[PDB]
Structures are given as C-alpha cells and as structure tokens.
Design a protein around this ligand. Sequence first.
Ligand SMILES: CC(=O)SCCNC(=O)CCNC(=O)[C@H](O)C(C)(C)COP(=O)(O)OP(=O)(O)OC[C@H]1O[C@@H](n2cnc3c(N)ncnc32)[C@H](O)[C@@H]1OP(=O)(O)O
Ligand code: NA
Ligand code: NA
Ligand code: NA
Ligand SMILES: [Zn+2]
Length: 268
Amino acid sequence: KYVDKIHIGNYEIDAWYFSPFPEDYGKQPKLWLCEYCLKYMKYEKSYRFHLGQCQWRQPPGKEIYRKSNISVHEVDGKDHKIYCQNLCLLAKLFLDHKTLYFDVEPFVFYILTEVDRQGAHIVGYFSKEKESPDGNNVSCIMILPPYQRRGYGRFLIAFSYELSKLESTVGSPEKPLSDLGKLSYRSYWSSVLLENLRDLSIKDLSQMTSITQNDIISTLQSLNMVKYWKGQHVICVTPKLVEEHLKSAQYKKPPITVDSVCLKWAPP
Ligand SMILES: CC(=O)SCCNC(=O)CCNC(=O)[C@H](O)C(C)(C)COP(=O)(O)OP(=O)(O)OC[C@H]1O[C@@H](n2cnc3c(N)ncnc32)[C@H](O)[C@@H]1OP(=O)(O)O
Ligand code: NA
Ligand code: NA
Ligand code: NA
Ligand SMILES: [Zn+2]
C-alpha cells in the first residue's frame, strides 16, 4: 500500500502519485509532516511530540528574497541533505515525472513560504541543477494543492527566470512538463512576451527575458504572432493586436510579482 494522505501544518492533503517513503512509512495510511523541517512521522502522537520539540520555524539556508510576508529560501542539497530529501518525497506525491529523491546533492532548492507571527509556512518550491547540460533553469516545480491557482506558481516561474537573467543566460524548464506545468508556463511566457511587445527581434526578446528562442517561438505561434519566411521565424504583430490579448479575460494582472529590489542574490 502507498502513502495516500499527509497532514502538514493545518492541512490534510490527498496524494496524487506514488512517493517512495520507506516501506513502514510508505505503508502507513497517513503521514504526518513537520511543516518547518519536513520530518515525516507515522503517528499523530509522534507528530504532536515533535511539534513541541522542533525549534525550526522556517526553511534552512539563506533567505534570498523577502517582500512583505512572502519569503524564498535558497537551500543547497549538499549542505542540507535530509531536509531536501524530505522535500523531494513530499514533492513526489504531486509530481508524476520526478525521479530523484535521495540524490539531492546536485541540486539547489528554492522554497517559497508565507510568513506570519508563528513562522514561515511552506507553499511550494522549485529545484534547479547546479550544472545543467540541457540548460534547464528549473528541474521540478510544485505548489502544494491548498495554495494552487493563487499565483504562487506564476511567482516561482518568474523567480526562476530572474535568476537566469542575473546569470546572463537563457533557461527552460526540464521536460516533460505536466499538463498543469504546461498551462502555467504557457500563461507566463505569453504574458511576459505580450507586455514586452506593448511597452524587437526574437533574439532580443530572448535576451531581455531569458526565455529560450524555442519557447518564445512556440508561444508566439500559439498567439499567431509569427510569420515564417524561407525558414526564419519573424515576429509579426501590431501594437493593437498585442493589446487585444492583454486586455481580454485571458491575461490577468493581479499577480504576486518578483521585486528585484527584494532579491538578494549573486550568480553561481
Ligand atoms: C518542470 C516541472 O516541474 S513539470 C511539473 C509541474 N509541477 C507540477 O505539476 C506539480 C503539481 N502542480 C502544481 O504544483 C501547480 O499546478 C503548478 C506549479 C503547475 C502551478 O502552480 P499554481 O499556483 O497552481 O498556478 P497559478 O496560480 O500561478 O496560475 C498560473 C496559470 O496557470 C493556469 N492554471 C493553473 N492551474 C490551472 C488549472 N487546473 N486549470 C486551468 N488553468 C490553470 C492559471 O489559470 C493561470 O493562468 P491565467 O493567468 O491565464 O489564469
Ligand atoms: Na486534498
Ligand atoms: Na490533493
Ligand atoms: Na482531494
Ligand atoms: Zn520539525
């Protein structure tokens, strides 16, 4: 039998996918997770005890972003191994394609939290290879179900590209994307590109946004804003065509935005 339900913080969450918590753990009905250190436990009683003893009230590593009560922590898999393993097992409950859980040393993890008087509460994360041959600026990205559809995922995507910009390089999420992942990246790419054509070659857009030319082209194609002339993709849009898309119900602007002023981060 698999883990099919977790209790974390004040939430109970049903699993979407198999996650390889150890047999005894992963043959318990429900796992209880400390929302701060992500230790997983078998019993309500061991969970209650731990809550009284655990002194963590935020993720480990460095707080590299903080605006109002939104916080991002940068966590090196090498320095912070158990925590990152616990994070990956948690993540795997909601990711179909994640294959890596214990071998966390090659990754850096960016943890999103909502802060209040009690502590910094985990919302989601993304992982990123320290060295990615495929130029992936995201390995996996996950927002916990009770926080989904509220702009946190868009925030993390935007955040991952701010990192890429600061690294002066283009980046793309590692494939295959979930359907939810595709919806979110298509939505993000479209907004960013449209806004850049409201207020330019594909080469220029890629340099300005750190979106890869491939992702720009596929996005522009879905928007019918590219012409194809003898094997070159050429941007073809009118400033009013741009604005029709942005003004429609399709593109909302009530986001949480990444404020570069609140980002404390120097490139690897
Ligand atoms: C590289 C990879 O990691 S691939 C796998 C991606 N990760 C996962 O699948 C983990 C499980 N899924 C998730 O955690 C989330 O669904 C994520 C990370 C994909 C998105 O996070 P969310 O906070 O829910 O997305 P967010 O609120 O920012 O909305 C982003 C956009 O995607 C759309 N969207 C998000 N979820 C849905 C959904 N079920 N149905 C339709 N549209 C959706 C939103 O409408 C929005 O578009 P819009 O601005 O035009 O309205
Ligand atoms: Na649920
Ligand atoms: Na669920
Ligand atoms: Na459910
Ligand atoms: Zn704990």
